[PDB]
Amino acid sequence: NDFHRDTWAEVDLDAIYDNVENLRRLLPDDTHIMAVVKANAYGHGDVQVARTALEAGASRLAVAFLDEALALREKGIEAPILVLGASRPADAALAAQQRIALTVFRSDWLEEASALYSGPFPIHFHLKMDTGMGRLGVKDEEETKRIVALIERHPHFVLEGLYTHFATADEVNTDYFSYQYTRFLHMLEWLPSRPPLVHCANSAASLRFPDRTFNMVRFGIAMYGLAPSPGIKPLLPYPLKEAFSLHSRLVHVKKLQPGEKVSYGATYTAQTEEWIGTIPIGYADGWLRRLQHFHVLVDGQKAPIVGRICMDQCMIRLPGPLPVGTKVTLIGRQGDEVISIDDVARHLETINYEVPCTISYRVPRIFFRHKRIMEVRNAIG
Amino acid sequence: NDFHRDTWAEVDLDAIYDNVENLRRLLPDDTHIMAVVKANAYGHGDVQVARTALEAGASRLAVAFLDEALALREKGIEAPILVLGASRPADAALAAQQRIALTVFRSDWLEEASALYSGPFPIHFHLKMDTGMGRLGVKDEEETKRIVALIERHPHFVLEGLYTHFATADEVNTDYFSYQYTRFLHMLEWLPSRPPLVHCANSAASLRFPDRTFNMVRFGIAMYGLAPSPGIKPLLPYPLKEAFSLHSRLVHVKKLQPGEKVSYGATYTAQTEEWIGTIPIGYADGWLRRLQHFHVLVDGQKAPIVGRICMDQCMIRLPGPLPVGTKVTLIGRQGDEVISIDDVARHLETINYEVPCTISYRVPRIFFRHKRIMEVRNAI
Numbered sequence: 032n033d034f035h036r037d038t039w040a041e042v043d044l045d046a047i048y049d050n051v052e053n054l055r056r057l058l059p060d061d062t063h064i065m066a067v068v069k070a071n072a073y074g075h076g077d078v079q080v081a082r083t084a085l086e087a088g089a090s091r092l093a094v095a096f097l098d099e100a101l102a103l104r105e106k107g108i109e110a111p112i113l114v115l116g117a118s119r120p121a122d123a124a125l126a127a128q129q130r131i132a133l134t135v136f137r138s139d140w141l142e143e144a145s146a147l148y149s150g151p152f153p154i155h156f157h158l159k160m161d162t163g164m165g166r167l168g169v170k171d172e173e174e175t176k177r178i179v180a181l182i183e184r185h186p187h188f189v190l191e192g193l194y195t196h197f198a199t200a201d202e203v204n205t206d207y208f209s210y211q212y213t214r215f216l217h218m219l220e221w222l223p224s225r226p227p228l229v230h231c232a233n234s235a236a237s238l239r240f241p242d243r244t245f246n247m248v249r250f251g252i253a254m255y256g257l258a259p260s261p262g263i264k265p266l267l268p269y270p271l272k273e274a275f276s277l278h279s280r281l282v283h284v285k286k287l288q289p290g291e292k293v294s295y296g297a298t299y300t301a302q303t304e305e306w307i308g309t310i311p312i313g314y315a316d317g318w319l320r321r322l323q324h325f326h327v328l329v330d331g332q333k334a335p336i337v338g339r340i341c342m343d344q345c346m347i348r349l350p351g352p353l354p355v356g357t358k359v360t361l362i363g364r365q366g367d368e369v370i371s372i373d374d375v376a377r378h379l380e381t382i383n384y385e386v387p388c389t390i391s392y393r394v395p396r397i398f399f400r401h402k403r404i405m406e407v408r409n410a411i412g
Numbered sequence: 413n414d415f416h417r418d419t420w421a422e423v424d425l426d427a428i429y430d431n432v433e434n435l436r437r438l439l440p441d442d443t444h445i446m447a448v449v450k451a452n453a454y455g456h457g458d459v460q461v462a463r464t465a466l467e468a469g470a471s472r473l474a475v476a477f478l479d480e481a482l483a484l485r486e487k488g489i490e491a492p493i494l495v496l497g498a499s500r501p502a503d504a505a506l507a508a509q510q511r512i513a514l515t516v517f518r519s520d521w522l523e524e525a526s527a528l529y530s531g532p533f534p535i536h537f538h539l540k541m542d543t544g545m546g547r548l549g550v551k552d553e554e555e556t557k558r559i560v561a562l563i564e565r566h567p568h569f570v571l572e573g574l575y576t577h578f579a580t581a582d583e584v585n586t587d588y589f590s591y592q593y594t595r596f597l598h599m600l601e602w603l604p605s606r607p608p609l610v611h612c613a614n615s616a617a618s619l620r621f622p623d624r625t626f627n628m629v630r631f632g633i634a635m636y637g638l639a640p641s642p643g644i645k646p647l648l649p650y651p652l653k654e655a656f657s658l659h660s661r662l663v664h665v666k667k668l669q670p671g672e673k674v675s676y677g678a679t680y681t682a683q684t685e686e687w688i689g690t691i692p693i694g695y696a697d698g699w700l701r702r703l704q705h706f707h708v709l710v711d712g713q714k715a716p717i718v719g720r721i722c723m724d725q726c727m728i729r730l731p732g733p734l735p736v737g738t739k740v741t742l743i744g745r746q747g748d749e750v751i752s753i754d755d756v757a758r759h760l761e762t763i764n765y766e767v768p769c770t771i772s773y774r775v776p777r778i779f780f781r782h783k784r785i786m787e788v789r790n791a792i
């Protein structure tokens with residue numbers, strides 16, 4: 032693939048491989064690994080990350096909704112895929128033909144599904160139990176038993192798994208986490224038979240308590256080399272390798288005189304002769320206007336963003352005159368300087384998860400494997 | 413093109429059409445309207461908006477960078493396109509072959525392009541002049557003449573136009589806008605022969621002083637029905653029709669008891685027995701975590717977003733029990749209630765420009781034209 036603007040993101044597939052292989056080592060042999068690649072692999076590239084994770088030791092994948100699962104199948108993925116969120120009862124046959132498992136938490140959903148489906152492909156379900164996250168999942172025994180019965184009665188409905196999800200597994204204090212786990216244990220008792228797959232752990236629960244994972248973990252954030260929470264960093268079993276970096280280049284360089292203003296609202300003023308650089312990245316690329324008090328890396332040195340960030344461009348105060356074309360690193364390392372996604376997240380006043388997901392479709396992803404470029408993906412190419 | 417999650421954006425091309433047509437009436441028959449459709453038409457859909465705009469009175473289109481212009485061509489658009497930002501001198505032949513005009517502001521760029529291109533297609537250039545925005549553009553006379561001499565000298569280089577861009581055209585106080593407009597007129601006198609197209613106004617400047625728009629107008633934000641700024645609203649010549657709306661549906665409903673917590677970090681606790689609804693939209697969709705305490709519309713009533721917003725989901729406090737499938741409007745109207753992109757931007761502490769752009773590729777766009785559904789665009 033080709034791109035014609037000097038702004039791009041890089042995905043180190045070697046980092047992804049290692050993060051997943053280190054986990055395969057950590058977890059008991061009886062515990063499967065399901066790589067979470069929803070939201071285009073958290074902005075890292077769905078098919079690329081899925082491929083690497085599966086070769087690193089993962090055996091199944093998970094996405095947020097049906098379209099994401101169909102896209103993976105489209106791109107050639109053959110491994111089992113579970114849709115973690117809601118879906119339409121009417122789309123049951125489509126998912127079944129495509130060998131896509133669905134999460135279920137309501138008996139009325141199955142009522143509607145049975146009315147519209149009768150074979151020949153089976154639908155594998157994963158019953159979601161709400162133990163304290165308050166999002167999706169059953170909460171009472173009655174509904175739990177009815178769901179199982181409706182599935183058990185239809186010839187083409189199969190109960191493949193059952194799970195829950197944690198709201199605070201990334202907090203050093205484990206009061207709530209412990210509550211949910213014990214809650215899960217009690218609710219599991221409502222099931223007449225234990226499904227082949229029982230799971231609860233995400234990245235944080237997996238890495239901290241590998242001995243409390245049942246037989247499948249759903250590995251997400253850590254697979255990308257990102258800490259579930261900076262607070263549990265010291266508690267991580269092995270070093271994480273960040274797989275995402277973002278770059279650009281100077282497309283214009285000029286020396287302002289004292290008094291000249293920069294960007295919208297004439298908000299910035301060069302009060303001394305200074306060199307200003309312009310890069311081809313803005314808020315429509317995920318470099319939100321909010322990151323205007325932040326900085327970037329140029330010539331291994333930090334250069335602050337100057338004035339308001341524009342839709343496709345922004346300016347920075349250069350330390351001195353530099354040539355057009357000089358590489359700029361928004362996320363990554365330059366010499367003795369480094370900008371991490373956690374750094375960006377802190378200035379955006381968010382969590383690392385949100386950062387790469389916001390880097391828009393507009394920005395090409397260059398994939399590296401075995402330290403060499405493996406491929407380029409330009410969504411608008 | 414269909415989709416399988418109950419979250420989608422709706423784009424009213426009739427609003428797009430009316431906003432543009434209304435400007436065409438405001439401007440003279442000589443003045444061209446250049447529809448700014450970069451960033452996938454500010455998150456509204458590049459092809460769909462480009463087509464509609466042309467039908468309504470636009471004669472040209474503008475994008476941010478080469479890839480955006482090439483994607484339009486591939487999608488069938490055969491109308492003129494100008495790349496507003498920078499490009500590689502090595503890509504000059506590709507732009508020329510695709511009939512894509514390029515913005516230029518450095519003589520060294522031309523020296524490079526010249527050594528790399530010799531035909532057969534001519535390449536149209538638009539010289540950018542920096543009059544106070546401090547982003548792109550030439551700033552001195554010598555460089556301006558050197559650029560022009562390089563263009564006139566090349567058999568396949570054509571200087572089709574020249575322009576500048578305003579930094580404060582949306583501010584009631586017009587002093588910096590004035591300095592800029594006057595600096596432009598001054599720098600224009602550095603050129604030997606004036607090019608066919610001379611432009612400088614965006615939505616604000618063109619709607620405010622359409623009499624001072626020269627040969628072309630670059631119409632962006634107002635085409636989408638959004639005000640360039642809150643302070644200019646009472647200065648707009650005609651009412652703008654908002655083209656973008658966003659909706660979802662409840663996929664789960666349940667009653668919590670006091671003391672029960674919702675979402676990550678359990679930052680929310682039900683103080684009383686309440687009905688909670690779960691919708692399939694989150695920050696990976698552009699619905700940023702910062703909107704946690706924002707209100708959405710459900711059953712014609714405002715319902716607050718409760719708990720931390722997730723990557724693909726979030727929870728809201730319902731007025732009471734409602735059936736799964738109930739329509740939720742994040743941006744739009746429901747009964748007497750309406751939430752505008754401006755309301756969302758106020759909560760996010762940003763400008764309206766940023767909001768539709770952030771609504772991601774995951775969210776399908778349903779287009780309406782002539783009060784009927786024309787097409788569904790599901791990027792994935």
Ligand SMILES: Cc1ncc(COP(=O)(O)O)c(CN[C@@H](C)P(=O)(O)O)c1O
Nearest residue numbers: 067196233234249250251252722723724
């Ligand atoms: C059901 C389910 N199973 C596993 C994971 C993986 O978790 P990690 O990324 O912390 O390893 C998630 C993640 N989801 C959060 C991003 P969000 O809730 O914001 O979608 C999930 O929802």
Ligand SMILES: Cc1ncc(COP(=O)(O)O)c(CN[C@@H](C)P(=O)(O)O)c1O
Nearest residue numbers: 341342343448577614615630631632633
């Ligand atoms: C050169 C240029 N010509 C015209 C327009 C249209 O302006 P309106 O959207 O206010 O009508 C723009 C817009 N660009 C801003 C969104 P941003 O500067 O953040 O990209 C521009 O850059």
